[PDB]
Amino acid sequence: VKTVAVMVGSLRKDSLNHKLMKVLQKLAEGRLEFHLLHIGDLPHYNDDLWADAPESVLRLKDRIEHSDAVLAITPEYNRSYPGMIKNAIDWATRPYGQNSWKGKPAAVIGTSPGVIGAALAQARLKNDLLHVGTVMMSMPEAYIQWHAEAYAADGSVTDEKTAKFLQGFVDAFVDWIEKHGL
Amino acid sequence: VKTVAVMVGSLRKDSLNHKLMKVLQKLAEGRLEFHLLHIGDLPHYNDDLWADAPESVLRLKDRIEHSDAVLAITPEYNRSYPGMIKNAIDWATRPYGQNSWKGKPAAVIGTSPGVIGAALAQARLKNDLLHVGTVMMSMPEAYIQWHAEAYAADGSVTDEKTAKFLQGFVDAFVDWIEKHGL
Ligand SMILES: Cc1cc2c(cc1C)N(C[C@H](O)[C@H](O)[C@H](O)COP(=O)(O)O)c1[nH]c(=O)[nH]c(=O)c1N2
Ligand SMILES: Cc1cc2c(cc1C)N(C[C@H](O)[C@H](O)[C@H](O)COP(=O)(O)O)c1[nH]c(=O)[nH]c(=O)c1N2
C-alpha cells in the first residue's frame, strides 16, 4: 500500500471536492492509503512565525515527508484554484532548504457543478506543484463535472461510465507512484 | 485625488513589499490616496460563512467598492504569488452576482531581493485579477529587485534611476485610472 498526502481545497460542509475525495478513497482502498493535510488549520503564511513554528505547519510537513505521494483535489474559484492550497504549498517548502514536496509523485483532480470541471484551477495547480519539485502526473486528465446521481451516499460510483473514468485515474496514479516514486 | 484599495502580499515585520507600498504612497501623495485592504484578517474562504459574513470580508468589499482603483503589491513565493492574495480576491467576488472587483482599474507591482523581481508572481496575479473583471494596466512592467541603498527610512527614493522608474509607474497608474475608471 502506498500512502498519499491529500489536500482537499474546500472547507464547507457539503463540499463536492470532499465527496470526490471519499469516492477516490473508496476506489483506491487496498492500494492507496489517504491521509488528509489539514490545510484549513494553517495561518496565512508569515515568515516571522518560523521563530515559533505553528503546530499545524509542522504536522503538514511531517505528513508530506512521510507519505509516498501527494494528491490535490481542487475546486475552481475565479478560474484558478483556492489560495488556501497555495498557502499550504508555500508553508511546506520552508524553511529554505527544507522543501517537503521535493521528489514526491503527485496528481491533481477536482470537480465543479459546471461543465468545465475545474480544469483551469487544475492546470494552474499542476503548474504550481510542478514548480515545487513534485513529479507531476498529467494523464488522464480528470475535469469532473459533478453529477449527484452518479454517486451513492457511501461514496460508491453508481454510474458505470463515471466509475470507469475515475478508476482509470486511480489506476494511473497507482502506477505513477510505483514508477516515479523514491 | 483618486482613492486606491491596496493589497500588500506580506504580513511580516520587515516586508520589502510593505516598504515598497510606502515608497509608492509617498511618490503618489496628492494624486492617489491609498487605503490598505486587510487581507491578513480574512479567514480561509468558506462559502458556509456567508450565513453570517465575517466583518473582515464585509470591510474588504466595502473598501474595494468605494475606491476608484486597486493596486496589488506582491512578493513571489515558489514562482507565483501568495495564496493570501487569492483568498482576498475570491472573497470579494462573492456572493454570486456581487463581484466587488468588476470594472475597477488595477495595477500590479512587487519586489524580491532576487533579480527576477517577482515577475512570475506578478504575471499570475495580473491574470487572476483580469479574470475577476478589473481593467488591468500592463505598462510599465515593474519587476523590482529590491536594493536597500536606493531608499531612505522615510520612504524617499534616493537613487535617481529608481526614482524615475517608480515615478513612471505611478504616473502611468494615475493616467490609467483617469482614462479607464468609472
Ligand atoms: C469564490 C467562488 C468562485 C468560484 C466558484 C465558487 C466560489 C464560492 N465556483 C463554483 C464552484 O465550482 C462550486 O461552488 C463548487 O461546488 C465548490 O467546490 P466545493 O463544493 O466547495 O468542493 C466556480 N466554479 C467554476 O466552475 N469556475 C469558477 O471560476 C468558479 N468560481
Ligand atoms: C515560501 C517562500 C517562497 C519564496 C520566497 C520566500 C518564501 C518565504 N522568496 C523570497 C522572497 O522574495 C523574499 O523573502 C521577499 O523578501 C518576501 O517579500 P516580503 O519581504 O515579505 O515583502 C522567493 N523569491 C523569489 O524571488 N522567487 C520565489 O519563487 C520565492 N519563493
Residue numbers in the entry:
A (entry chain B), B (entry chain A): 2 to 183
The authors write:
The flavoprotein FerB (ferric reductase B, a product of gene 4071) was originally isolated from the cytoplasm of the soil bacterium Paracoccus denitrificans as one of two major enzymes able to reduce Fe(III)-ligand complexes when NADH was the electron donor. The protein is also active as a chromate reductase and, to a substantially greater extent, as a quinone reductase. There is an expanding list of bacterial flavoenzymes that display redox activities against diverse xenobiotics, such as heavy metal ions like chromate, nitro compounds, azo dyes and carbonyl compounds including quinones. These enzymes occur as homodimers or homotetramers with a non-covalently bound flavin mononucleotide (FMN) cofactor and display a bi-bi ping-pong mechanism with NAD(P)H as the presumed physiological reductant. For this, the crystal structure of holoenzyme has been solved and the effect of mutating the strategically selected residues has been analyzed by means of fluorimetric titration of free flavin by apoenzyme, enzyme kinetic assays and spectropotentiometry.
